[PDB]
Amino acid sequence: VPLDGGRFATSDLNDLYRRVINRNNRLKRLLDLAAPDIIVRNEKRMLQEAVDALLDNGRRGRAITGSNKRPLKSLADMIKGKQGRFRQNLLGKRVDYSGRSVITVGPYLRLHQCGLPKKMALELFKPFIYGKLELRGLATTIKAAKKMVEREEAVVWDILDEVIREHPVLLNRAPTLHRLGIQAFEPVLIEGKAIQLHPLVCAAYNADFDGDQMAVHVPLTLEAQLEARALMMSTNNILSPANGEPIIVPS
Amino acid sequence: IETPITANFREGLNVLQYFISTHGARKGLADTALKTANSGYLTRRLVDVA
Amino acid sequence: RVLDATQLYLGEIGYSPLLTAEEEVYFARRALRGDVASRRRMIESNLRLVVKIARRYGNRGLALLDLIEEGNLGLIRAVEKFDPERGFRFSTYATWWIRQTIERAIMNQTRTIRLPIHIVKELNVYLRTARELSHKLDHEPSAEEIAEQLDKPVDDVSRMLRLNERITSVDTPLGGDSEKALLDILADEKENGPEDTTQDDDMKQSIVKWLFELNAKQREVLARRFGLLGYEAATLEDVGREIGLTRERVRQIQVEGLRRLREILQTQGLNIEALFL
Amino acid sequence: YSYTEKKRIRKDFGKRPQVLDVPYLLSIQLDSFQKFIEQDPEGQYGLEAAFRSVFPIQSYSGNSELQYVSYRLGEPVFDVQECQIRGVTYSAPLRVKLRLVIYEREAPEGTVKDIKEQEVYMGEIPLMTDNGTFVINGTERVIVSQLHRSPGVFFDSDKGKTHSSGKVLYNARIIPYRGSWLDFEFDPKDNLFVRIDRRRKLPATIILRALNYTTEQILDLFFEKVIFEIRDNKLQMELVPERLRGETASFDIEANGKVYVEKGRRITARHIRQLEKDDVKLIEVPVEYIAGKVVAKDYIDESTGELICAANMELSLDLLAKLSQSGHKRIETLFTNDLDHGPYISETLRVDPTNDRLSALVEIYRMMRPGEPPTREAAESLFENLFFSEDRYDLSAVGRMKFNRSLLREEIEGSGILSKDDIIDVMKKLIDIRNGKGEVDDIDHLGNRRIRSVGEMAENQFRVGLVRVERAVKERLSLGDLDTLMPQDMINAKPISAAVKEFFGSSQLSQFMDQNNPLSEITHKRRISALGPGGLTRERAGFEVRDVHPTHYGRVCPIETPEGPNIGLINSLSVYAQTNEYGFLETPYRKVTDGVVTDEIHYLSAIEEGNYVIAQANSNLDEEGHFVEDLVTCRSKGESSLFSRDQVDYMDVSTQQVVSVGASLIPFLEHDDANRALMGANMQRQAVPTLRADKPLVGTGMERAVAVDSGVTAVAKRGGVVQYVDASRIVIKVNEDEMYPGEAGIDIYNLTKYTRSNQNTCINQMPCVSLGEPVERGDVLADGPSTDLGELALGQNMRVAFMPWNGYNFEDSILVSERVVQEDRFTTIHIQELACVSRDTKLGPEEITADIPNVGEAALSKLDESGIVYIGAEVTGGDILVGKVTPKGETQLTPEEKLLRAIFGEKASDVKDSSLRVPNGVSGTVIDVQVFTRDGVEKDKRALEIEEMQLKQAKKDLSEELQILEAGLFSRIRAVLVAGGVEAEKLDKLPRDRWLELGLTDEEKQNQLEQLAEQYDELKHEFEKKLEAKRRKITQGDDLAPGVLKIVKVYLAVKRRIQPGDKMAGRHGNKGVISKINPIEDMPYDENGTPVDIVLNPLGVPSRMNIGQILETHLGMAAKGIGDKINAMLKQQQEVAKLREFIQRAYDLGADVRQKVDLSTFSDEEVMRLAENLRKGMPIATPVFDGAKEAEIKELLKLGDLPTSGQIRLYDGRTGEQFERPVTVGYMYMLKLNHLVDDKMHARSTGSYSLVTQQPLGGKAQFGGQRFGEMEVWALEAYGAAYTLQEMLTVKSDDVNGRTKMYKNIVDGNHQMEPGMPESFNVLLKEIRSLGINIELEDE
DNA sequence: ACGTATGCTATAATGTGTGCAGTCTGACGCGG
DNA sequence: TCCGCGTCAGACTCGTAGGATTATAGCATACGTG
Ligand SMILES: O=c1ccn([C@@H]2O[C@H](COP(=O)(O)OP(=O)(O)OP(=O)(O)O)[C@@H](O)[C@H]2O)c(=O)[nH]1
Ligand SMILES: [Mg+2]
Ligand SMILES: [Mg+2]
Known part of the structure; x- marks a missing residue:
């Protein structure tokens, strides 16, 4: 595929494939010439080197290095280990309706509450604004609703505020050690780029307000809203699963 | 060390008392970064079987 | 052995x-x-x-x-x-x-x-001319400086230098340490995300409503010309193949369909709102 | 004291007078490069070395050859000013003279046949600034110094390779600067082996055979000899009394007349002196004793001529009897000892399957090139090429130096190649260590970790350029025609240019240095790393490396290093630390002569530190004499204890040499844990400079040193009166004594005005001097972005109070007043740079016009006709900075668009839109815009308006230069003319253009008038070509990447205010997020009324153990108390004498104050300019370890009429009622870290998608969702929330059906699960099929 | 006709090599 | 079958930063489509 800068970019497979096809076609040419076997031998050894390098480069011998003196990424490599498809592009995923930001204290909040910035929840609940807008009849279509949100007009804040009520959000902190590394709350819109977290559940996350960031996630489906309120709500999660002991102890 | 640190933080460490404090400080914080991976790798190992 | x-x-x-x-x-x-x-x-x-x-x-x-x-x-x-x-x-x-x-x-x-030989052959002489110049100018020669020594076109030199531009693999480490490659950044051109997918679905369902809200012969003639409901995008003259069979009456009825539809966009809240777009 | 110091003096609580003044910060870097370019005549260094090393190069035949003559540096094409802006390397032309000499073939050596000679360019080398930076593609970058294992020899031992045996196996290793490795190692059976390049393991006698050594010589170089005589009938043996030492008498030991030891008895030291004093030489012995002993030399039968017994063969009874009757009654054997002189080479030869020299070169050749049939030359050439050729091998100076002193040698400087001697000497000391004497070296000692700054590394990379040219020279010379071919046709300039830019770009040491803080710049240039090429790796890095080593003392800082996996490797250099002439580090030390602590200083190497005993700086001098106390706490041999007076040899110079720059700025470091001290010094580097530079009330004194040496300020080259003050520039008139007699003598300093940083922050230089002020040489004229009267000003000090506040300071959370936000004091400035590129696509060229399709008049309001936003125009996310349009190809107008473009009209043209618009979110003020264009297509009208200014502003700027330079030049002539022909007004009648017309009598001053007259003309002619260079470069086309036609670079300047989420900290590692900006109504306040600025959590203190912040607070309060008293007297408008008494009483209070500043010396006017700066608060210096103690701080608090405690009676603002009991209040110098929340927060609903994985991208950079990793996944599995996970695996990530379908369902209100199956898995299926594996989805 | 591709030239020349070598604990898989 | 030595397998989780290559002759008929 071509870059924005007029450059192109190719995967190392294409390069490894051109090594296979060239040598294979050169063998067809030498079998046409009935060349001496000594040469045919080299061609067959080469062909094998290329095939073996295509399947799993760094294994039989030296991995065929390319442009930046680094080894070409082969096929097996895209299925292999951390950097493979399994761990990196299948069990772990970047996810929509997700945002992260510096957290700060929320000593006014109750246990089942957490501060959520307005401009954050704005972008996060984008399809829920367009939905409640068509209902009231303020938007006839969705690109109309898109512009209504963009202009940040006053009455759009009140609609956003409407959908978010009685709607839980997932708050994650890295690293996710135990299940309590994510807990759900009822978002409270606050003007400012900081998330406000409940002091007592700080223990579960191990979240220190020294510049911590927590990922936000919106439960879309009604089942996810029920799951978040039933299982993952902060009030329904008190005791540690490890020990029958309250992890929400004042500190 | 045969000779420990006599002073405290209110009184002030001398130049070495701090140099000595370093040895323990850097190695304690080296095991915060490096040794965490063995324990986090254990979490991974435990999970897969369970 | x-x-x-x-x-x-x-x-x-x-x-x-x-x-x-x-x-x-x-x-x-x-x-x-x-x-x-x-x-x-x-x-x-x-x-x-x-x-x-x-x-x-x-x-x-x-x-x-x-x-x-x-x-x-x-x-x-x-x-x-x-x-x-x-x-x-x-x-x-x-x-x-x-x-x-x-x-x-x-x-x-x-x-x-x-790269075939013809474009390559020439490129070499442009590059080998850059050697001569570079040693005596002590300055890497420009596209112009190479063009003034050969007395050859500016765009030719430039376009031949464009084909010398090499590639970076999409699987190349960024920062010389396991972090992310160009594939974990470079986006997909073809498919735009749901918001762009639902734009056209909702925009084109709104038009299906606006056509059933027009005249019986006005939404027939207007739709089948642009190829909206019909199969082939015809012209004012080609709408006559169907039942219209007219040149003046087709053009007055096409524009009559559009004028009643322009008032449907002024009232619903677009017109100049959806003009910027 | 100086004038700029007279304006504001810092009270110093130091009691250890500085014998050594802090050196220049930027020194190593500068000196390093100062060696690389330096064209040394003979002592080759840098480039001169690189040429003499590789050159002369000769053809493969050897009939033609190229010879190096001389090289030179041309002045830079583009200077720093220009380079920083355009965006191309600040480099200098490399012109090297080459000489092509060709010989006659049949003739001997016809050297004089064609001595062709010419000058040739090859590559442009990035130069170093005066700051120690390299401008690469418009980025001042720093090449951090590397820390690597020093070449030579090194003895190590895996304390248990096979813990099976648990045997400490000793090994040696010769490390060269260039060449192959040579290792020697034992094994479970103590057989010596050699592994060149750590390849195959080969017996260690095989390498000796290769050096032409017979089995006999090998045994006569390691082991001793044992004379065995067979006299008449009694077998006899020579005894050196000191041999049967610590062994057992296996036989009855009896001499000329006496039995000393009995059978099966230990021979003690008494028995050895018993025998040695009796002068015993010969002893009769049994024949059973030789059974086991090894014969030394060969023994042929005198009679037959055959070997009775070969050298190195264990003797027996029958072999000895065969030798006695052959006719040899003088036998030589080896001295084997299982304890001391060990038999290793002996047992090794029994494993060694080789024979002679030529056969030993075979297995050496069969190791490194296995499979190629070996010849006499191939085997010899290889081995000779390894460690014995001037080409392949080079230990270097350091290599041979360390190699020699490791072997306790004779020479410091010797040969680059390994000699026979060297090899065997190394095997010998390896065997010494194995025996018991000799200790192994350890790598963690800095005596083995050498420092390699840029200049040597630039030399190395420059060699590879020459090596890659060597190839092209030789091959073109031999086969190419001799005569026709010129030397530059065979040279290529790209391989050198590419190999050097490889270093100045891709290298791990070559990176961008922080510039958001003077401390960041200076500490990042003083960074030293072990990583990148020829070093270590996080993957490879151990513990013992990282750990602080007692060699670091005075050399490297114990508390300066990232707390990330790159923890112990990266390290800043110590304050007074400097590089050894060879490479190691060295630290200053006060020599003690005959007890007298002499002021003579000696920089002791890492090696010689261990030798002498070194007293600490805590030790007390007797005011010119010796140590006051008899016992002195000192340190040596890497240990510490008390010693006597005469035993002390050296002493620490200052008390700050242990620490770095980063740590020398922390006050009361002595009262801070090393863990929090590290974080404090790490965050002090992240301190973004504020709007108004506020000086620190609680400093150390190092403040000025940093600000000045950073090269961010503008200090006076020559002292005199400031003729002119201006915001843009400074003009100073030089005094007669300093001013040169030739030139005029008026220095020019055009101050760098507001422009961008590498971290997108403000860079300004404001004049810190008044119009017409007398300034001394080396005084700060303009302050930098984070400096104040020359002293460092990183953050701002404020009244702080330690107490909790309704949990708004929970876990280190910060509660800041609105009054701080009102003063806009923590309001930092951000300078972003958005660029706009006109490219050449396949369809056609792009341009830059105001004509943009589908646009609001609102967007094109801030743009001009050319299509660039006005200077000073405010912009916001969505507004367009620079209008761009690209070509639009075959476009399928969809029926719904053909109808919509036919309804409202506005038919778009054949051109696409891609205008550079302010990124969604950012908002600031455009401060400047710069336009770069190729040399061709006609310009925009705005590009012409900007050319108008540059030109007419340059014409003015140069007019001003020649004007004021004229006035300063005639000012001299006017003074010269009076001396001789004294006439005042009559001379000043007619104009000044007819002054060179007037002269003087035959005198030195007549020659002076001619100098100034023809120098005035020299400037008059110079002015034109100065104008030419400006004019041309303003109309010249800058060279761009292929495809690019022109670029427009925009500079924004947002003013971000502090807000909840912003991260701030002290310098004691006390971190915190601002949680709430409290109303001024609600802020706590003292009985007197003034409120508190920040309210910190007291619980962020005990567990942290960083009590330095509390002392910073207390002193800050005291310091302010004194400013509050001075502020009151200056407001009251009292008197000069009253201020003088109080301020003199303030400066003089400490026990032994270092500075004794008398104010009777200060004039009345000089006192009032001082007091006016002291009113904000008397700035105090607390040296790192020689800081102020409670006795001094509490005494200062009594002067300020402040409480001894430091706790004040506080009242709650919300209420008005007092808090239940006192709280510490004072002024703590806090900082505003770069981690601002506007640059952090992110949100996403739906946006871009990945290329193959088809999951969203990553980061707010590209607008990407947060990653939900496997750990994040297991959490939901644990809860049981199954859809919440499946939702985050499919619709929120890949599932192409799901994501769009779900979107449409949400806007409908029906939040319904609609899964399908992520794309990333459908990829995995085909990927396994592409690997030749049948993986199909087997159905129900 | 325009672009791509195939072809020939004749002093003699006849066996490559290059490049990071404190990672490490743990676990098999062929010989010996 | 058992003990040494070779190759081959992993390495806590999320955020941010930035850049550049060398060279393949020279000219005359042969092969593919508007
Ligand atoms: O490499 C690191 C270092 C630290 N951390 C995490 O960051 C936090 C730093 O340490 P904290 O400041 O959270 O410490 P603490 O509350 O457990 O104890 P005190 O300070 O009160 O004595 C801890 O929660 C630690 O797990 C990491 O996740 N990784
Ligand atoms: Mg934290
Ligand atoms: Mg904490």
Whole structure:
């Protein structure tokens, strides 16, 4: 595929494939010439080197290095280990309706509450604004609703505020050690780029307000809203699963 | 060390008392970064079987 | 023993004839007349000559083993067309072939994007002219500075330099440490995300509502012209094929459909709102 | 004291007078490069070395050759000013003279046949600034110094390779600067082996055979000899009394007349002196004793001529009897000892399957090139090429130096190649260590970790350029025609240019240095790393490396290093630390002569530190004499204890040499844990400079040193009166004594005005001097972005109070007043740079016009006709900075668009839109815009308006230069003319253009008038070509990347205010997020009324153990108390004498104050300018370890009429009622870290998608969702929330059906699960099929 | 006709090599 | 079958930062489509 800068970019497979096809076609040419076997031998050894390098480069011998003196990424490599498809592009995923930001204290909040910035929840609940807008009849279509949100007009804040009520959000902190590394709350819109977290559940996350960031996630489906309120709500999660002991102890 | 640190933080460490404090400080914080991976790798190992 | 494909072949050439002047002629004279064994020998013998010529033609496109293979093909074409009757040696004539076959095979399998010889041949003279200039200007020559020495077009020099632009693999580490590649950044052009997908779905469902809200003959004639409901996008003149069969009445009814629809967009809340878009 | 110091003096609580003044910060870097370019005549260094090393190069035949003559540096094409802006390397032309000499073939050496000679360019080398930076593609970058294992020899031992045996196997290793490795190692059976390049393991006698050594010589170089005589019938043996030492008498030991030891008895030291004093030489012995002993030399039968017994063969009874009757009654054997002189080479030869020299070169050749049939030359050439050729091998100076002193040698400087001697000497010391004497070296000692700054590394990379040219020279010379071919046709300039830019770009040491803080710049240039090429790796890095080593003392800082996996490797250099002439580090030390602590200083190497005993700086001098106390706490041999007076040899110079720059700025470091001290110094580097530079009330004194040496300020080259003050520039008139007699003598300093940083922050230089002020040489004229009267000003100090506040300071959370936000004091400035590129696509060229399709008049309001936003125009996310349009190809107008473009009209043209618009979110003020264009296509009208200014502003700027330079030049002539022909007004009648017309009598001053007259003309002619260079470069086309036609670079300047989420900290590692900006109504306040600025959590203190912040607070309060008293007297408008008494009483209070500043010396005017700066608060210096103690701080608090405690009676603002009991209040110098929340927060609903994985991208950079990793996944599995996970695996990530379908369902209100199956898995299926594996989805 | 591709030239020349070498604990898999 | 030595397998989780290559002759008929 071509870059924005007029450059192109190719995967190392294409390069490894051109090594296979060239040598294979050169063998067809030498079998046409009935060349001496000594040469045919080299061609067959080469062909094998290329095939073996295509399947799993760094294994039989030296991995065929390319442009930046680094080894070409082969096929097996895209299925292999951390950097493979399994761990990196299948069990772990970047996810929509997700945002992260510096957290700060929320000593006014109750246990089942957490501060959520307005401009954050704005972008996060984008399809829920367009939905409640068509209902009231303020938007006839969705690109109309898109512009209504963009202009940040006053009455759009009140609609956003409407959908978010009685709607839980997932708050994650890295690293996710135990299940309590994510807990759900009822978002409270606050003007400012900081998330406000409940002091007592700080223990579960191990979240220190020294510049911590927590990922936000919106439960879309009604089942996810029920799951978040039933299982993952902060009030329904008190005791540690490890020990029958309250992890929400004042500190 | 045969000779420990006599002073405290209110009184002030001398130049070495701090140099000595370093040895323990850097190695304690080296095991915060490096040794965490063995324990986090254990979490991974435990999970897969369970 | 030996498990490197390199050293194994390089061993087998090391146990192959090293021909004299009169020997070359004896074999070559029979090789043209087809002795079978003769063509095999002259070739087997001068594999050693191909390797010495491939020791200078490396680090340019393919590997040393890839250069020898294609260098051997040059020695073969040299054997297919050698003149023993001429008093001149073979090693001389074969070198012209082995240097050629290598250069040519590098020019094809070096670049991912197959660059033919014509655009490449010229590029070399532009680059080799840059050498002369660079040494005496002590300044890497511009597209203009190269054009003023050759007295050739500006865009030609520039477009030939555009094809010299090399590639970065999408699987190349960014920052010289396991972090992320270009694929974990570079987005997909073809499919735009749900918001762009639902834009057209909702915009085009709103039009299906606006057409059933127009006239019976006005939404027939307007839709089938643009190819909205019909199968083929016709013109004012071509709407006559269906039932219209008119040139003036089709144009007045097309625009009559659009004028009533322009008031439908002024009232619903678009018109100048959706004009910027 | 100086004038700029007279304006504001810092009270110093130091009691250890500085014998050594802090050196220049930027020194190593500068000196390093100062060696690389330095064209040394003979002592080759840098480039001169690189040429003499590689050159002369000769053809493969050896009939033609290229010889190096001389090289030179041309002045830079583009200077720093220009380079920083355009965006190309600040490099200098490399012109090297080459000489092509060709010989006659049949003739001997016809050297004089064609001595062709010409000058040739090859590559442009990035130069170093005066700051120690390299401008690469418009980025001042720093090449951090590397820390690597020093070449030579090194003895190590895996304390248990096979813990099976648990045997400490000793090994040696010769490390060269260039060349192959040479290792020697034992094994479970103590057989010596050699592994060149750590390849195959070969017996260690095989390498000796290769050096032509017979089995006999090998045994006569390691082991001793045992003389065995067979006299008449009694077998006899020579005894050196000191041999049968610590062994057992296996036989009855009896001499000329006495039995000393009995059978099966230990021979003690008494028995050895018993024998040695009796002068015993010969002893009769049994024949059973030799059974086991090894014969030394060969023994042929005198009679037959055959070997009775070969050298190195265990003797027996029958072999000895065969030798006695052959006719040899003088036998030589080896001295084997299982305890001391060990038999290793002996047992090794029994394993060694080789024979002679030529056969030993075979297995050496069969190791490194296995499979190639070996010849006499191939085997010899290889081995000779390894460690014995001037080409392949080079230990270097350091290599041979360390190599020699490791072997306790004779020479410091010797040969670059390994000699026979060297090899065997190394095997010998390896065997010494194995025996018992000799200790192994350890790598963690800095005596083995050498420092390699840029200049040597630039030299190395420059060699590879020459090596890659060597190839092209030789091959073109031999086969190419001799005569025709010129030397530059064979040279290529790209391989050198590419190999050097490889270093100045891709290298791990070559990176961008922080510039958001003077401390960041200076500490990042003083960074030293072990990583990148020729070093270590996080993957490879151990513990013992990282750990602080007692060698670091005075050399490297114990508390300066990232707390990330790159923790112990990266390290800043110590304050007074400097590089050894060879490479190691060295630290200053006060020599003690005959007890007298002399002021003579000696920089002791890492090696010699261990030798002498070194007293600490805590030790007390007797005011010119010696140590006051008899006992002195000192340190040596890497240990510490008390010693006597005469035993002390050296002493620490200052008390700050242990620490770095980063740590020398922390006050009361002595009262801070090393863990929090590290973080404090790490965050002090992240301190973004504020709007108004506020000086620190609680400093150390190092403040000025940093600000000045950073090269961010503008300090005076020559002292005199400031003729002119201006915001843009400074003009100073030089005094007669300093001013040169030739030139005019008026220095020019055009101050760098507001422009961008590498971290997108403000860079300004404001004049810190008044119009017409007398300034001394080396005084700060303009302050930098984070400096104040020359002293460093990183953050701002404020009244702080330690107490909790309704949990708004929970876990280190910060509660800041609105009054701080009102003063806009923590309001930092951000300078972003958005660029706009006109490219050449396949369809056609792009341009830059105001004509943009589908646009609001609102967007094109801030743009001009050319299509660039006005200077000073405010912009916001969505507004367009620079209008761009690209070509639009075959476009399928969809029926719904063809109708919509036919309804409202506005038919778009054949051109696409891609205008550079302010990124969604950012908002600031455009401060400047710069336009770069190729040399061709006609320009925009705005590009012409900007050319108008540059030109007419340059014409003015140069007019001003020649004008004021004229006035300063005639000012001299006017003074010269008076001396001789004294006439005042009559001379000043007619104009000044006819002054060179007037002269003087035959005098030195007549020659002076001619100098100034023809120098005035020299400037008059110079002015034109100065104008030419400006004019041309303003109309010249800058060279761009292929495809690019022109670029427009925009500079924004946002003013971000502090807000909840912003991260701030002290310098004691006390971190915190601002949680709430409290109303001024609600802020706590003292009985007197003034409120508190920040309210910190007291619980962020005990567990942290960083009590330095509390002392910073207390002193800050005291310091302010004094400013509050001075502020009151200056407001009251009292008197000069009253201020003088109080301020003199303030400066003089400390026990032994270092500075004794008398104010009777200060004039009345000088006192009032001082007091006016002291009113904000008397700035105090607390040296790192020689800081102020409670006695001094509490005494200062009594002067300020402040409480001894430091706790004040506080009242709650919300209420008005007092808090239940006192709280510490004072002024703590806090900082505003770069981690601002506007640059952090992110949100996403749906946006871009990945290329193959088809999951969203990553980061707010590209607008990407948060990653939900496997750990994040297991959490939901644990809860049981199954859809919440499946939702985050499919619709929120890949599932192409799901994501769009779900979107449409949400806007409908029906939040319904609609899964399908992520794309990333459908990829995995085909990927396994592409690997030749049948993987199909087997159905129900 | 325009672009791509194939072809020939004749002093003699006949066996490559290059490049990071404090990672490490743990676990098999062929010989010996 | 058992003990040494070779190759081959992993390495806590999320955020941010930035850049650049060398060279393949020279000219004359052969092969593919508007
Ligand atoms: O490499 C690191 C270092 C630290 N951390 C995490 O960051 C936090 C730093 O340490 P904290 O400041 O959270 O410490 P603490 O509350 O457990 O104890 P005190 O300070 O009160 O004595 C801890 O929660 C630790 O797990 C990491 O996740 N990784
Ligand atoms: Mg934290
Ligand atoms: Mg904490």
